Every structure is written in C-alpha cells, then in structure tokens.
From TrEMBL, chains A, B:
Cellular localisation: Membrane
Gene that encodes it: mcp40H-2
Protein name: Methyl-accepting chemotaxis sensory transducer, class 40H, putative dimer with helix-swapped heme-binding site-containing PAS domain
Organism: Geobacter sulfurreducens (strain ATCC 51573 / DSM 12127 / PCA)
Family of the protein in this entry: Belongs to the methyl-accepting chemotaxis (MCP) protein family.
Complete-protein stretch covered: 37 to 165 of 696
Superkingdom field: Bacteria
Chain residues that bind heme b: 99
C-alpha cells in the first residue's frame, strides 16, 4: 500500500485548492460549478507496468525506448480517453549494488490514469 | 480544466516512482506486483463541494464546522470505500477585498476520492 491513495488525495487536494482559489477571485459560483463538473469521475489509476533498460517488459517498446533515450518522462494522451506517463528509472548509486553502474537507467515505469468520467477499469 | 488531471497524474507518478524505488531495493518483482494490484482502479474523484464559513453548503455541517474550528484539513475514511478531505479555505489578503478581513476562513472545500477498485461514480 504505502498509503498511496491518501498521499495522492492530499497532493490532489492541494492542486484543487489552488485552482479553486483562482476561481474564487471572480466572486462567481458558476465558474466553480463548471470546474467541478469537469473534474468528477476522473483520475483512477488504470495501469502500472515496469520495463527494463532495453524497453522490454518484465519485443522492445518504441515509446519506452524513446523515453529512455531522451532520459525524460514522456506524457502521452491516447485511447476510453486515458493519460500515460513513461518514467525512466534512474540507476541511482543505491541501485548500482546490483545493476551495472554503466547504465544511466535500469528501466522505466508506465503509469496510466483515466480521463474518462466514471471509468476506472 | 486548468489541466488538473495531467497535474494530478504528474504528482501521482512522482509518488509511485518513489515507492517503486523502495520496492526495487529488494530485487524481488513479486513485491512490485502486489503494490500494483493494490493501486489499480482507485483514485477517481467522486465529489468536490464548497462550504461557507459557517459550515453550510452553497443546516451547518458538523465535520466541516469542526474542520473550520480546528483550522486544519480533516481526513476521513468512510463509505463504497471512499476518502474525504475537508480543507478550510483561508481568507487570504487577496480575498479580503470582498470577504470581511475579520474571518480567518471564507469557507471550506470537500474533496472525495475512491478507494474502491473500479468505482469512479
Ligand atoms: C482566495 C480568495 C477567496 C476565497 C478563498 C473565497 C471563498 C469564497 C467562498 C468559500 C464562497 C462561498 C461561500 C460564501 O458565500 O461565503 C465565496 C462566495 C463569494 N465570494 Fe469569495 N472568495 C475569495 C475571493 C473573493 C473575491 C476577491 C471576491 C470579490 C471580487 C469574492 C466575492 C464573493 C462573493 C460575492 C461571493 C458570493 C457568491 C454568490 O453569488 O453566491 N470572493 N467566496
Ligand atoms: C532504486 C534502485 C533500483 C532500481 C531503479 C531498480 C530497477 C530495476 C528494474 C527496472 C528491474 C526490472 C527490469 C530488469 O530486470 O532489468 C529490476 C530487476 C532486478 N533488480 Fe533492480 N533496481 C534497483 C535496485 C536493486 C538492488 C539494490 C538490487 C540487489 C539487492 C536489485 C536487484 C535486481 C534483480 C536481481 C532484478 C531481477 C528481478 C527478477 O528476478 O526478474 N535491484 N530492477
């Protein structure tokens, strides 16, 4: 668990409170209602996978390889509407005890969330 | 919109990458699989409401009043399993142009997310 949902909700509440604050400056409740309607039913985690340094999962994956090559997280919206994040996993010094220090990354993490209201897998 | 889902996903990916890192130190993929299984299908925003400084929505709400009185966010797990956050909205100086500066808070924000796999409203 690691209490992820609670931590995610806390982070999300901070984001939402920040946006609500901007909307409140207008002194118009209608704008609040429209923000809420666009947020409801979304955010559910749809998938979480791990890939090796070659872009292969647990043939290589082009987007993952590209992500590994660019050395940056890749954000891709695609279809149900969903959002996918490919995060390269850095071969930190603590990891180097079991992963050759010659590799910048040991693999990548694929996270996908739902942008479809009411859809959670 | 304010691109909330993307910002939430980015924040979530940071949380997940941190946890995955701890699990990777074990060099055991089984533990990764169990974390993923416990995360899937959760996180969907179920509700987002606003309350005034008295605990009334747009009779007063006891938990909201308490939240306003304690001056701190209240985290409450309850039932479908869900997670509710009551965040008091501080009457910042920029808000004081239209809300009497004598009130510490102008109201509160209620955010509820799903802890039920597959449930998104
Ligand atoms: C971050 C700063 C602000 C916060 C936190 C805030 C918060 C709130 C909250 C919680 C409500 C709903 C409950 C209630 O009616 O008391 C509200 C209502 C309202 N606020 Fe603010 N507010 C802020 C800034 C402003 C500003 C700058 C204005 C003036 C331009 C404004 C004008 C009003 C008005 C007129 C309402 C009534 C809405 C209606 O017609 O029902 N607020 N505000
Ligand atoms: C934050 C540090 C670490 C990261 C980012 C990391 C990441 C990864 C990744 C992405 C994989 C799956 C793909 C692959 O097999 O290459 C993996 C596999 C593995 N890692 Fe790590 N690792 C870390 C630390 C460690 C440590 C400290 C050990 C040694 C105690 C370890 C031992 C292994 C082993 C043996 C596997 C094979 C798993 C299997 O049996 O299939 N890793 N690691």
């Amino acid at each position: 668990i690691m209490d992820l949902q609670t931590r995610n909700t806390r982070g999300l509440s901070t984001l939402v409170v920040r946006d609500i604050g901007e909307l409140m400056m207008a002194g118009d409740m209608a704008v609040i209602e429209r923000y809420v309607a666009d947020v409801r039913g979304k955010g559910a985690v749809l998938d979480l996978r791990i890939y090796d340094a070659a872009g292969r999962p647990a043939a290589p994956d082009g987007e993952v390889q590209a992500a590994l090559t660019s050395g940056a997280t890749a954000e891709k919206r695609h279809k149900r509407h969903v959002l996918s994040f490919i995060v390269p996993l850095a071969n930190e010094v603590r990891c180097q005890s079991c992963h050759e220090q010659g590799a910048r990354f040991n693999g990548a993490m694929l996270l996908t969330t739902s942008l479809e209201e009411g859809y959670a897998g």
